[PDB]
Every structure is written in structure tokens, then in C-alpha cells.
């Protein structure tokens, strides 16, 4: 049964609620982004109206085969009317196609659902600036002060510099990047751009990237692995056994692998700076864990909320334990007392 924190009161709407069968009273189903924990349940047999971004709509049609007549894509930053309720989709700074959703209830209440997001000061100048928000449904993934990580830009600087140095020392090294979902495309695209290579990948993954409206993509990716020196593999194969095996398959073209695992947070963050990150090495294989996040750090989250000043916060992540819930509620109170709302 659908939990309360996926329901929008005073509407017929749910958010990211496709795994519960027919939700009683739901007249439209919103989907914030194409990640499996959120889309779980959608297929070609779905016959209710789904409302989402253009990019999420492309993925629904091509990857899950949802029928076109049930896909309702909306433009960003534009006031739209859905079943008699004004809504606006905003960029969530998460994966491609990811949105937050502003709902303007018929009684005057205004709700923001963040979906999954990485808060940024740029959001303080969207259509959020223009009215008060009463209730916030918040991505609380890293809602604890131990979660610090660098900017995306510092992480890509590290990755480009490391790859360029390694391949310039050894023109026979191959770079491998792990993936298991959309998101974090800048990692492998930035490395390929510095090396003057296209990214090589499976046909399934190529199909997925072709749905993303990324400019000049035919220029950056390919299914011809033999022509590429940056290869994308499943995240599960990013280990010494999986990489040894892949290196065999390249037929003696390469004699070394440098690999990247973009994680979110890992406790090496508490102590070590990005500049100081070192790989795990075995023989001619090195594996770098890099803290590339698509969710808010604790500080980014706190800045957003203290700027928005919502009357009520509803967490959407870490809600399954009493200790987690109590911890987040204590931070929300601190923030409110410090800022004065
Ligand atoms: Ni997500």
C-alpha cells in the first residue's frame, strides 16, 4: 500500500508511486526521474496518465515501452494545468530529466516535492522565488553533518587530470568507467573529451543515452569498442576480476587499465581531500573511487531549506527507522531556530 509521503493532499495525485497497483483515488501519476526505485512498476500495460519531463518521457517510451497515448510530458519552468490544478516542473540538478514539482492547491496551499535533488544556489532564482511554500517533501538522503563532498566541478577536474596523465605516460592504457543507471554522464564524457576519443559501450546503454537530449551526442559515444579508449561497463564489473577479464577481450591492444567508480559518499570523505585520493592497485589495474554526488550535501540541503522557509517538512528518504526520523527532525528544528522562521 502506498505510503502517505507519496500522496499530495487535496489532489488526485501521487509522486513516484507505480509499485502499489491501482492507488485508490489517484487520477494522475507523476514521475520525478527515471531511476528504478522510483519508476518500479511501470510497463507497456500501464493505462493511467503519467506526467513527467520530456526526457523521462523518451525513456518511458523507448526503454519500458509505455504507450505514447498515456505519456504526458511537460515543459520546464512553465505553468501548466493538470486535472484542474496548476503545476510547474523545475530542474532538480539530479540525473538527466529529473524534476522537482510545485503544486498550487485549489485552497491556496503551495507544495514543493523535490524528487531526488542536489540543492544549488541557482534554484534561489527560479520560479521558487515568486511565492511562499507551505509544505516541502524533501530528499533527505544525506541529512547528517558527516556528509561533506566536493563540488562536481572539482571531482571532474581530478578525473580529467588523472586520466590525461596516465594515457600520456602510457598510450596503451585503457580507461574504464562504471555505470548502472542514468546520471553522472559528465564523468565519462569529460574524460573522453580530454583524450580525443568517443566513449564505447553496449547497444543497450547507447540506446539509453540516445533518449537524453544531450547536445552533440552522436559526436561523443559509440558502440564500436575497438575504436574507443574509454569504455563503459556495468558497475558490478568494476573490480580486479572483472577488469582482468575485460582486458583479455581487447586482444592485446592495451596493457593497463585505469578505472573509475563514481560513488555518492564514502567515509574516506571525513578525513581525505579530493586532491589526496589514491587508487586501489593490483598489477596493471588501478581503481579510483570518486565522490561524484547527484544528491545535496548536508550543508547544501540546509542552505536551501533555510532560504525557502517552509512551514512543514516531510522527509522522503531514511524514513524507515525511528532513530533516522528523530535525527532528521532534530536538524529541521535547529535550522528553523537558527534562521528564525
Ligand atoms: Ni535518483
120 and 242 assigned to the same domain: no
Phi and psi torsions of 87, nearest 5° = -135, 155
Q: Give the residue among 139, 140, 141, 137 at the shortest CA–CA distance from 8.
A: 137
> Are 56 and 29 in the same domain?
yes
User: Ligand 1 mean position to 9 CA, how many Å?
Assistant: 23
d(CA 45, CA 64): 10
Which residue range(s) make up the domain with 157?
Answer: 148-295
Q: How far is the CA of 36 from the centre of ligand 1 (A)?
A: 8
How deeply is 37 buried, as exposed, middle or buried, from its count of CB atoms within 10 A (0-12, 13-18, 19+)?
Answer: exposed
Whether residue 118 is found in the same domain as residue 130: yes
Q: What was the experiment behind these coordinates?
A: X-ray
Q: How far away, in angstroms, is 253 Cα from ligand 1 center?
A: 37
Whether residues 109 and 219 fall in one domain: no
- Judgement on whether residues 5 and 101 belong to the same structural domain of the protein: yes
Q: Do the beta carbons of residue 79 and residue 86 sit within 8 Å?
A: yes
Please give the distance, rounded to the nearest whole angstrom, from the Cα atom of residue 35 to the centre of ligand 1: 5
Question: Same domain, yes or no, for 305 and 289?
Answer: no
Dist. CA 58 → ligand 1 center (Å): 17
The number of domains in the chain is 2
Asked if residue 157 and residue 142 are part of one domain, the reply reads: no
166 shares a domain with 109: no
Residue 340 shares a structural domain with residue 247 = no
Q: What are phi and psi of 116, to 5 degrees?
A: -90, 135
**Resolution of the experimental model, in Å, one decimal:** 1.4
DSSP per-residue string spanning 90-149: EE-SSSTT-EEEEEE-TTS-EEEE--S----GGGGGSGGGGS--SEEEE--TT-STT---
Residue 316 Cα to ligand 1 midpoint, Å, equals 12
Angle at Cα 273 formed by Cα 159 and Cα 166, nearest 5°?
30
Amino acid at each position: 500500500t502506498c505510503p502517505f509521503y507519496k500522496k499530495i493532499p487535496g489532489t488526485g495525485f501521487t509522486v513516484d508511486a507505480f509499485q502499489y497497483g491501482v492507488v485508490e483515488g489517484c487520477t494522475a501519476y507523476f514521475l520525478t526521474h527515471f531511476h528504478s526505485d522510483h519508476y518500479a512498476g511501470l510497463s507497456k500495460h500501464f493505462t493511467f496518465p503519467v506526467y513527467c519531463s520530456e526526457i523521462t518521457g523518451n525513456l518511458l517510451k523507448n526503454k519500458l515501452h509505455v504507450q505514447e497515448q498515456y505519456i504526458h510530458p511537460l515543459p520546464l519552468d512553465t505553468e501548466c494545468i493538470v486535472n484542474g490544478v496548476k503545476v510547474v516542473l523545475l530542474d532538480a540538478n539530479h540525473c538527466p530529466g529529473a524534476v522537482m514539482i510545485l503544486f498550487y492547491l485549489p485552497n491556496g496551499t503551495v507544495i514543493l516535492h523535490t524528487g531526488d535533488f542536489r540543492a544549488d544556489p541557482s534554484m534561489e532564482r527560479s520560479l521558487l522565488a515568486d511565492q511562499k511554500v507551505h509544505m516541502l517533501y524533501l530528499d533527505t538522503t544525506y541529512c547528517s553533518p558527516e556528509y561533506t563532498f566536493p563540488s562536481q566541478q572539482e571531482v571532474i577536474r581530478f578525473a580529467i587530470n588523472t586520466a590525461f596523465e596516465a594515457v600520456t605516460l602510457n598510450p596503451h592504457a585503457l580507461v574504464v568507467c562504471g555505470t548502472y543507471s542514468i546520471g553522472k554522464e559528465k564523468v565519462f564524457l569529460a574524460i573522453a573529451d580530454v583524450l580525443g576519443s568517443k566513449v564505447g559501450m553496449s547497444q543497450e546503454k547507447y540506446k539509453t543515452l540516445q533518449c537524453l537530449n544531450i547536445p552533440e551526442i552522436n559526436s561523443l559515444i559509440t558502440t564500436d569498442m575497438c575504436s574507443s579508449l574509454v569504455h563503459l561497463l556495468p558497475m558490478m564489473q568494476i573490480n580486479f576480476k572483472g577488469l582482468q577479464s575485460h582486458l583479455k577481450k581487447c586482444g592485446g591492444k592495451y596493457n593497463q587499465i585505469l578505472a573509475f567508480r563514481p560513488t555518492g559518499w564514502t567515509h574516506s570523505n571525513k578525513f581525505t581531500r579530493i586532491a589526496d585520493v589514491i587508487p586501489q592497485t593490483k598489477g596493471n589495474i588501478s581503481i579510483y573511487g570518486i565522490p561524484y554526488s547527484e544528491h545535496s550535501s548536508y550543508l547544501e540541503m540546509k542552505r536551501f531549506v533555510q532560504w525557502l522557509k517552509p512551514q512543514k517538512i516531510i522527509p522522503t528518504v531514511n524514513v524507515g527507522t525511528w532513530k533516522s526520523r528523530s535525527t532528521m527532525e532534530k536538524y529541521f528544528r535547529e535550522w528553523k531556530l537558527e534562521a528564525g522562521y
